[PDB]
């Protein structure tokens, strides 16, 4: 049967404090506890005792009513606290209604798994419970946990604070550890849920027990370091002892400074998790509940001596544990030590205040004010305890505590909502080495309703922080697409899309359409400039100058002819045939123009018509003359005109059908993806049919010319005609394959036409001009 710390009074209030540590592994069945706790144990015991004494001394609170207490150990364990709560029920209930006074309410425990079952046991008998550290979020279900209240906020805000911290410093690939229980587990689920939305990954979650063996943490480090060196941050909702085990195993295995580790309030500002191992933990960032120090307890606590304390059963044992001695004559001598304590050892040596004492005192004050308000609002007729209040009712007390409004010892008004959750604030401490062999926790940031006010300059002391734990660097630099292996979306591989493909999707590119080149930064497509030989090429210049020379000769010749219509040479020859020849040459030399210019809807069509019409409109007169000279060896001028007009009409009809089959148009040729040209729309048939017609005409010409070769008549005209026909046949045969052997077909055709016209001009115009002149 364990010991209890009691203080008599009219009203009795219970409390569960973990004076001893948790039972070690394989010893749970014996329910035997470990070492004594200095800051989570006895400090809270003395705080409760002094607080109740002080509030008893206060006249304005519970007049004529004295308040007692009953403090019991819980050993941070589930079964032990269940037994102690059953003892609370036994002290109440049968032995009290018909032992000691009934227990009004409890204050504790401080863990989110023990408090749950204690509430389960204490909600059947209607005993309110006010916790001070069980900051889990599964205890805010007032339908299932009806008699539970808190003086601290839940951990749905610690998860937000940790997410904001890990996001503010551009961390993306994080590990994950959490101690098994209803504090680490739910908090880590909340962290995962609110981290998925913000685009922050999780390398691999883990789970370990605080009391796990020495060899169960080496495996945890091995599985945590298997991911190295990609994840240099470990997010923890672990308790203090889990972090202590991690630090010890890191020192044993040799990972001093291997990776930063981020922690919760479980090891916020606790010197009892890094003492002796303060070299491994430098860098960690811990969130803490914002609680200023209290001087009442400091003044009262330091004067305590073991020989003058008649209220705390766990004091002398604590004294020999802290100062490592053995009191000679004390009842709990504990002679397993040596070097007995002097009479000069005091508590003000290495004093460290507990980090959650204001919450304890505020919980006690909240219970007292609930009792006082219900007393003054249920029994107004008397100032004290009246028969209408005997016995006290649990439901009325709960409905009186759910409306608390008062100022705590820290100076802040304490009021919690219908869910029983007082508001709170957070600090972000950093563990680092202030001096040589000197280490400390220093305040850096804060947190209140998302206003994370941190110090980027204070942490890492420079612009070179820890290597950002990111699996993939910002690789999509504007010319590479992103491809994933499919196993994980956190980090990816990079594939450069082709030079014809520009970036459209973050994951894939798309090729530009035909006639469009990807831009310089690959953000879009741009129309390729068109290339056409307008005026600057030397070959068009040579063709133009040759055409100009031929045209000047033709105009001079026709002017000379028109000067005197009647002449011996003019009388012998027919004016109609020479006029037809001149018109054909002029039409051809005009067709040389309007083709070298920029193609249009009408210009290219006119050029195509002319290049076919000119040889047709030219050869007709000469073939008629050859036919007449062959017949010699609608008559005369009438016959010549009829033949010329019939041939012209036939050629015009052929050309009309030619461009009826293929209507004129302008097109953009695509010789390659790099270059785009501008051309007129034309068909091979529209070139072949005039070519075949001219070939038939040339065949008739050469046949008739070879027929009448002997005649020296018409001033020896037969030799000139035969030589002209032979030259024209030769050039036609040479120029037929030229049109299908290069990309300069326009220039070749223009040159061939110009020289073909010039040959006939030189053959026929010069002799008659000489005959006119000399």
């Amino acid at each position: 049967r364990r010991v209890v710390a009691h203080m008599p009074g009219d009203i009795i209030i219970g409390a569960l404090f973990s004076v001893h540590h948790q039972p070690t592994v394989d010893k749970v069945h014996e329910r035997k506890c470990g070492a004594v706790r200095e800051q989570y144990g006895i400090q809270r015991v003395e705080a409760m005792l002094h607080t109740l004494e002080r509030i008893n001394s206060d006249p304005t609170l519970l007049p004529n009513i004295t308040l007692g207490c009953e403090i019991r150990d819980s050993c941070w364990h589930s079964a032990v606290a269940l037994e102690q709560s059953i003892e609370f029920i036994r002290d109440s209930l049968i032995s009290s209604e018909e032992s000691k006074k009934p227990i009004v309410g409890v204050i504790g425990p401080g863990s989110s798994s023990v408090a749950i079952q204690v509430q389960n046991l204490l909600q059947l008998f209607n005993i309110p419970q006010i916790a001070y550290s069980a900051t889990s979020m599964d205890l805010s279900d007032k339908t299932l946990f009806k008699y539970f209240m808190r003086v601290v906020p839940s951990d749905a805000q610690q998860a937000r604070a940790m997410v904001d911290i890990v996001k503010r410093y551009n961390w993306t690939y994080v590990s994950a550890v959490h101690t098994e229980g209803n504090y680490g587990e739910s908090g880590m689920e909340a962290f995962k849920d609110m981290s998925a939305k913000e685009g922050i990954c999780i390398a691999h979650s883990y789970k370990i027990y605080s009391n796990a063996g020495e060899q169960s943490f080496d495996k945890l480090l091995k599985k945590l370091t298997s991911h190295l060196p990609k994840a240099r941050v470990v997010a923890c909702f672990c308790e203090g002892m889990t972090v202590r085990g991690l630090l010890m195993a890191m020192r044993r295995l040799g990972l001093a400074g291997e990776f930063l580790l981020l922690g919760s309030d479980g090891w916020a500002d606790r010197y009892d998790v890094t003492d002796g191992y303060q070299r491994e933990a430098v860098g960690g960032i811990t969130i803490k509940l914002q609680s200023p120090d209290v001087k009442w307890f400091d003044d009262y606590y330091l004067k305590l001596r073991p020989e003058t304390n008649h209220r705390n059963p766990w004091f002398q044992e604590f004294w020999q544990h802290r100062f490592q001695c053995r009191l000679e004559g004390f009842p709990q001598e504990n002679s397993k030590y040596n070097k007995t304590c002097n009479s000069s050892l005091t508590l003000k040596t290495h004093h460290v205040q507990d980090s959650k004492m204001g919450f304890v005192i505020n919980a006690i004050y909240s219970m007292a004010y609930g009792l006082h308000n219900m007393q003054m609002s249920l029994c107004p007729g008397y100032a004290g305890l009246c028969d209408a209040m005997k016995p006290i009712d649990g439901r009325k007390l709960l409905e009186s505590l759910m409306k608390t409004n008062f100022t705590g010892v820290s100076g802040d008004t304490i009021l919690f909502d219908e869910n029983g959750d007082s508001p709170g604030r957070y600090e972000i401490m950093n563990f680092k080495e202030m001096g040589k062999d000197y280490f400390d926790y220093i305040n850096v940031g804060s947190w209140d309703n998302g206003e994370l006010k941190m110090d980027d300059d204070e942490v890492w002391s420079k612009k070179s922080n820890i290597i950002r734990s990111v699996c993939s660097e910002p690789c999509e630099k504007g010319q590479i697409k992103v491809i994933r292996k499919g196993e994980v979306s956190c980090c990816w591989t990079c594939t450069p899309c082709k030079e014809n493909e520009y970036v459209f999707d973050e994951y894939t590119c798309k090729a530009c359409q035909l006639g469009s080149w990807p831009t310089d930064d690959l953000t879009g497509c741009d129309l390729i400039p068109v290339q056409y030989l307008r005026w600057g090429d030397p070959e068009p210049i040579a063709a133009v100058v040759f055409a100009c020379l031929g045209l000047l000769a033709t105009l001079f010749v026709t002017v000379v002819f028109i000067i005197y219509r009647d002449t011996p040479v003019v009388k012998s020859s027919s004016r109609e045939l020479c006029y037809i020849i001149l018109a054909g040459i002029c039409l051809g030399y005009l067709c040389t123009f309007c083709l070298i210019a920029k193609p249009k809807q009408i210009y290219c069509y006119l050029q195509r018509i002319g290049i076919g019409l000119s040889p047709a409109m030219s050869y007709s007169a000469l073939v008629t003359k050859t036919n007449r000279i062959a017949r010699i060896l609608f008559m005369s001028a009438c016959a010549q005109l009829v033949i010329a007009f019939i041939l012209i009409c036939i050629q015009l009809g052929i050309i009309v059908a030619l461009f009826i089959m293929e209507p004129p148009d302008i097109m953009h040729d695509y010789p390659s993806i790099r270059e785009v040209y501008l051309i007129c729309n034309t068909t091979n048939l529209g070139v072949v049919t005039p070519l075949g017609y001219n070939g038939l005409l040339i065949l008739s010409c050469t046949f008739y010319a070879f027929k009448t070769r002997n005649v020296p008549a018409n001033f020896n005209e037969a030799k000139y005609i035969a030589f002209t026909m032979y030259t024209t046949c030769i050039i036609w045969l040479a120029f037929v394959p030229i049109y299908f052997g290069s990309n300069y077909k326009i220039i070749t055709m223009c040159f061939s036409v110009s020289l073909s016209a010039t040959v006939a001009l030189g053959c026929m115009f010069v002799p008659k001009v000489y005959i006119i002149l000399a």
Partner: nanobody
Amino acid sequence: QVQLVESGGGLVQAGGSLRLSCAASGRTFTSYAMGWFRQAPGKERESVAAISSSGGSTHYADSVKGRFTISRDNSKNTVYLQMNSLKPEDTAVYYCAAAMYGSRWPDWEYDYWGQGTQVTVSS
């Protein structure tokens, strides 16, 4: 509260030996230091011996030092005092006491008493 019961005392010839047994009720006996006191008619109460709650430390009065032995057994919930040589001053009534919030010996703040036992020593 837990009750204390005494046994083993009586009348014996001087120079003999005896064993005095003190037993406590309840189940919280493992956390209570136990003191042996004496009281003779016509004089004020006097101290005899003491044993710590955890054991392993014994306190003997100077007047009886070197001849009396004390031991405890928590399993059967008792403390035994082996008394030897039957000194003439032993003819008195012996009390058993329990203290837990004590100070340096012999100041122990006893709060639980017992009926004791009368031991008479012949001449």
